[PDB]
């Protein structure tokens, strides 16, 4: 959607994912967190767990 | 931005033709013309303010006879308007020619819709930038609006041009179905004063009408206009005070 | 993919005409029209709902007879419908001229579609911006949907326009093949209510139908729309309570 | 950019035609012309003061006899004038061919505009960036300006070309509708004198008129012109000392 | 690529006309049409499922009659399918008009390819976005595939559309010329099983075939389909145990 | 870059539409031709210097017979010249076919201007990039310039091409209306001299005249041009000392 | 390169048409076709090689008959060949209409290269993108390559296609003007087998030939290729070990 | 340059037509053809140089018979030249039909230049990228060169093609104006020898000529080339060592 | 119909929008907006509250 812009944002995103269930636990989290779209979200965070 | 308005043939993903919407926005930079339909006639009002002391007082003067009981006013390109008016006349005389039948208002409006839709669809040309108000009494009074595209819409009172938006609101409040000729003549004048934001004098309007009884086109004269002006201007003043 | 969408002589590299995809979105910026097929005939209903009371909804038409046993409804530009139904009328009648036979529903659907394909070959003409639902009885009821692309598909219940999605989910549950005339009519009305999201008023809906038994087209006045609209509206209330 | 202005069959997002608005300015790029209507005829005055001693004093011309009793001036591009006036003249004699009727001033300009409407709609051809002023006496004097678009405006006094803006201002205070033929003739010249910013010499400016007693095109040779010019030149002096 | 594909006229550095090969992608999306030749006739099997179950999917229909021994199935636009088939129909009956011979399988294919091709070389018009297989027995089985390009490739078994991929890879192992009438009809039905990835119902499928010993196109009713469908359903399921 | 000189169907905002002023720049680059008007005729002079000894010293032509009383000379492309000069010769004769009147220089001029403007106005064809000088004596000597725009400009004496500005200055000072045929001829040979910044030898120039007392075109013979040149060279040399 | 290949009208700066260049690549993508002309006739051989056993025994058709003693074979786009060849047959019939003589190969070739030339001139229609080798025996054997450009070139042994380069190199050594009828046709099989990089069998080559001594075109059965193929394999083998 | 070279319709502010010049860069890709005009006849010498030993020397020629006493050469596209020159045959023919006078070489050149000229003006079709040398003798020899514009230039010694610049230099130096048919023939063999940069064999060249006394076209046999060629080779070797 | 520059504006814009409602009932953060007209502003900033 913009050459520097998706990839910069995609990096912040793919970090956030590691802690969520990449190798690393919940840690009693309990997330919770809002959006207004579902189309812009990676399939990777979208699935359960 | 895109090139869906770089052609007349090319649809946008939104579903639209912006090229037509910019033929819409060719209408709006022409001055106000208003049509009011009553249960006794239909009364067609058009600005004649546009001009100068320099110019004639009867500078365009929009309310051209199309048939002896059909008049048609304009807003948009006064160029684009004249050919459609002259075509309008030719289509009305064809109806008489081929049937010896007074031209139905609805059917003439159909024929105008067909005429512009050829110019809409075809891309080695552009559609007309003008909206006409088609009005006459076949044996019931009618007012229609024809669009740049050639879209037929039925109205019982409407305006086209810059004055459209102010007047739409005005009729929603005041317009009623119990209305009459005399009452309509005053209402439509009030609504023309809103559009220009200033008071009426008998010479800065033309008003045409097709009565149901006479069933003839008649112009209101400046002398007849003066008393309708006195009555109209009463409400003009009120709605232009804050 | 970008720029394979500003001609109609142009396929995209993904295979699909996106030009046509944008011509099917003009239908959806129109007003819904639903058709439902019963054994006793074929019923065609259309949203005559209008956004204001300065227009007169009754006269603004929506749904036109085409042949004496075929009727048709439009969704999209008023404008493109005018060229297309004038095409239709002339074609339906041209069959009667050289065969003396009232045109078959498939066959008219086909000839309108061949017209619409021809405006989709040449880049020199803008493809149509409407869809028709073609419903008559030839010898058996048929209920087609013509597509702006100039394709025809047989359906037994269908819609066109903005309500297309909702009427599909509705008739997915409640459509039966064993419906009677009175039941089909009711079901179609209920469905139109979902699409506008509100009750029906007799005065802003038009229904026309062609029976198999009679093979004559007849048009439902507001007076006779009344019995059906009470029964439909109770169901709409319940369904849109959820 | 901006425009949406490389095609005439594409409207700007304002809804305007850049192409025509641009072609309006080519009238202005060319030489001035001053038309003035009075109540004892109509005078058209055309600027033929241009270039150095390398050119002849006659420089064509710029004030063509259109009909016996109708004349026109031109401002703008000469090439475009040459063909426009050709059609104008042929149409003036065509009315007499089919009606044996001296063409009305009014109708002649309406059809000069109608030709030009065609070259504004159809993208297969340029707009003519030229404006004629049309002066004659059908049986009352009338003065029109025809426009590149094909818009049509009745004046009673005007300027076009280089002096278009300047002379509008000259005439707010000075011009009345109670002037004599002679007064008018002198006043159209003061204004012309205003435009080039210099004393006028009648040996390179061409004046014609149609009176109401005459009903014939006549042309004023420089010997005759001398006293008119002498009453203009005092005033041109008064102006250029303030 | 780019720029060698947003017109019909353009050649690419490869020599290919990517525009035409992108209308072969228009075919490619929706749906299987299968042709299978044998030495005891030719059998043409085609898809006939269309959308959900509101859609009547027991008609519309790929296997169009074109002569008394000529039939073609379609894959691609439905819009293009009607006109191309209609032309095909015209050309068949021209041979009867003028030679009092039903036309040969070869010549009809030859012709209708040339027709698509004429339209390839013209610009401002596109080739048809549909592909047919031309099945017939003149006195000999033939099976052709006529391309949206307007080229001719004779096959002894092929498929177009979505299922093209499956049926090719299947026919590498299976196809032989030792097939009879029966073995081919069941074997192409298995071929189609693999293509939509499901078991067959004789409701959603349609078969026409042209036999040497009748010299007729015949269109197989669903009761008649059903025996052959039983034979095939066991094969298709063993092959979807991969 | 400008984007207002892609086609002639575009205009500039400046009013000086660039693509026909680029047809003007085509003229300038071309090599010189001068028209010099006296009271005893008109004299017309044009380059024949072109090429070295590969090229003919008898290269035909730049000095065209159009009539046996009208000559023409050119600058710009001799290709564009060729077709135009052809049309000139037929047109002139066409006046003769339908009147049996010698076409006057003024009337001939207006017709070539009209021809030029056909090509100028249409956007599917470019203007001729050539200018024309038309010299005759109908019974009064006359000289015009016709622009590649097909615009008409009258001169006392004029030149075009590379040497336009030098001659322009030359006749600015010296040119009078009291020059005799001898005086004006030698004066224009001086001016041609300057244009090519060199002497004149009788093979670098072709010179023709239309006389008053014969009103017929005659071309001055090579050795007959030699004494005018002989006196001219004296002067050309005085000024190229500077 | 860029912008000189978006139509056939445009030339690039070197004077090359890049559109036309892409048309030779069009020849080269397609299958090899070789012609070898000898004193006793002219033999034309074209690759019948198929990438599947699901294509016909003879795929229709690689080598056309186009007159009594005139044949051509194709390489490049085989879609265009159908139209090209439809025309080539007609032109050769035509000369038999109007002088009732067998057309000579040269004049037939001229006329087909005019038909290309026609689509080369116009920028509306894209040119032929297929090359044919038209071969026949008139007064003596003649052989041409007619190129997409609309050019003819005569050769004494030739090639076009994929194999084009390989068979130019081969004949440069091996071809000579001392070759018999049989030694030549056999030499083309050797040429063809290198080209595909495989031993030849009758089902992957198509041969016709032209005899002097019969003065008629014949098309050689797969059966009567069998001896020549056998003779050919030895040389091909040696060549594929080199 | 940059869009002002990508259509033929355009101009540049240089005032060039870059498209025409590119069409002239086409003339310079092809091979040299050289003509000399002497008082006792006209000489035409064409390149016949073959790219290969498999190319047939008979046609790759430039020289075309046109009239009994007119031949011509071409440089440019092959395709363009044969169509263009078949037009010059026709034109020569028309003249003979309607006046019964064989076409002069000068008139022919004006006619075929004007034919190229409709294709240069028009936007819908490209000009030819050809120059001709039109050589004949009418009463006394004539030699003209046609430009790709359609410009017409008279010459006495001229070239077109690739070898042209050196041939221009060559005829400056070497050619004399007292030379005979025989002596100027040899000199043109030295000039062809220069351009191809080897000592000619008389089987890579072709000579045609027209003498005044014979008043015919002849074509020089290989037998009859040799004395000119042997004489030439002696002076050609000297320029390739010095 | 998209544009590339707009994608930037919008991911910024929503964070403007977010804070404005955001001040907890603890602390009083009042704001005064200004704009050229509502004719250039989206529905979502024209939103009540
Ligand atoms: Mg929040």
From Swiss-Prot, chains A, I:
Leader sequence range is: none
Q: Where in the cell is it found?
A: Cytoplasm
* Role of this protein: ATPase which is responsible for recognizing, binding, unfolding and translocation of substrate proteins into the archaeal 20S proteasome core particle. Is essential for opening the gate of the 20S proteasome via an interaction with its C-terminus, thereby allowing substrate entry and access to the site of proteolysis. Thus, the C-termini of the proteasomal ATPase function like a 'key in a lock' to induce gate opening and therefore regulate proteolysis.
Q: Which family does the entry's similarity section mention? A: Belongs to the AAA ATPase family.
SUBUNIT field: Homohexamer. The hexameric complex has a two-ring architecture resembling a top hat that caps the 20S proteasome core at one or both ends. Upon ATP-binding, the C-terminus of PAN interacts with the alpha-rings of the proteasome core by binding to the intersubunit pockets.
Q: What's said on domains?
A: Consists of three main regions, an N-terminal coiled-coil domain that may assist in substrate recognition, an interdomain involved in PAN hexamerization, and a C-terminal ATPase domain of the AAA type.
What is this protein identified as?
A: Proteasome-activating nucleotidase
Give the originating organism: Archaeoglobus fulgidus (strain ATCC 49558 / DSM 4304 / JCM 9628 / NBRC 100126 / VC-16)
- Name the lineage: Archaea, Methanobacteriati, Methanobacteriota, Archaeoglobi, Archaeoglobales
Encoded by which gene?
pan
Range of the intact protein held here: 253 to 301 of 398
Curated annotation (Swiss-Prot), chains B, C, D, E, F, G, H:
Q: How is its activity regulated?
A: The formation of the proteasomal ATPase PAN-20S proteasome complex, via the docking of the C-termini of PAN into the intersubunit pockets in the alpha-rings, triggers opening of the gate for substrate entry. Interconversion between the open-gate and close-gate conformations leads to a dynamic regulation of the 20S proteasome proteolysis activity.
Compartmental location: Cytoplasm
What are this entry's molecular-function GO terms? threonine-type endopeptidase activity
Q: What is its main location?
A: cytoplasm
Q: Name one Pfam family in it.
A: Proteasome_A_N
InterPro entries, A to Z: Ntn_hydrolases_N, Proteasome_alpha, Proteasome_alpha-type, Proteasome_asu_arc, Proteasome_asu_N, Proteasome_sua/b
Q: Which PROSITE patterns match?
A: PROTEASOME_ALPHA_1, PROTEASOME_ALPHA_2
Q: Which SMART domains match?
A: Proteasome_A_N (SM00948)
What the protein does?
A: Component of the proteasome core, a large protease complex with broad specificity involved in protein degradation.
Q: What is this protein called?
A: Proteasome subunit alpha
Native organism is Archaeoglobus fulgidus (strain ATCC 49558 / DSM 4304 / JCM 9628 / NBRC 100126 / VC-16)
**Gene this chain is encoded by:** psmA
């Amino acid at each position: 959607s913009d050459t520097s812009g998706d990839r910069e944002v995609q990096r912040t995103m793919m970090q956030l994912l590691a802690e969520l269930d990449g190798f690393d636990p919940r840690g009693d989290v309990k997330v919770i967190g809002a959006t207004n779209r579902i189309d812009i979200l990676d399939p990777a965070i979208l699935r359960p767990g | 931005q895109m090139g869906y308005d770089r052609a007349i043939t090319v649809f946008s993903p939104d579903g639209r033709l912006f090229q037509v919407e910019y033929a819409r926005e060719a209408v709006k930079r022409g001055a106000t013309a208003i049509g009011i339909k009553c249960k006794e006639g239909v009364i067609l009002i058009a600005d004649k303010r546009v001009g100068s002391k320099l110019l004639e007082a009867d500078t365009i003067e929009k309310i051209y006879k199309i048939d002896e009981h059909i008049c048609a006013a304009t807003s948009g390109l006064v160029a684009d308007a004249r050919v459609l008016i002259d075509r309008a006349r030719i289509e009305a005389q064809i109806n008489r020619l081929t049937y010896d039948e007074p031209i139905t208002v609805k059917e003439l409006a159909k024929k105008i819709c067909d005429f512009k839709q050829q110019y809409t669809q075809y891309g080695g040309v552009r559609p007309f930038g003008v909206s006409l108000l088609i009005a006459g009494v076949d044996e019931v009074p009618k007012l229609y609006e024809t669009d740049p595209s050639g879209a037929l819409l039925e109205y019982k009172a409407t305006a086209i041009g810059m004055g459209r938006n102010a007047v739409t609101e005005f009729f929603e409040k005041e317009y009623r179905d119990d209305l009459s000729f005399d009452d309509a003549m005053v209402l439509g004048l009030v609504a023309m004063g809103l559009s220009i934001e200033s008071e009426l004098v008998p010479e800065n309007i033309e008003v045409g009408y097709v009565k149901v009884d006479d069933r003839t086109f008649k112009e209101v004269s400046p002398e007849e206009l003066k008393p309708y002006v006195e009555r109209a201007n009463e409400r003009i003043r009120e709605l232009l005070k804050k």
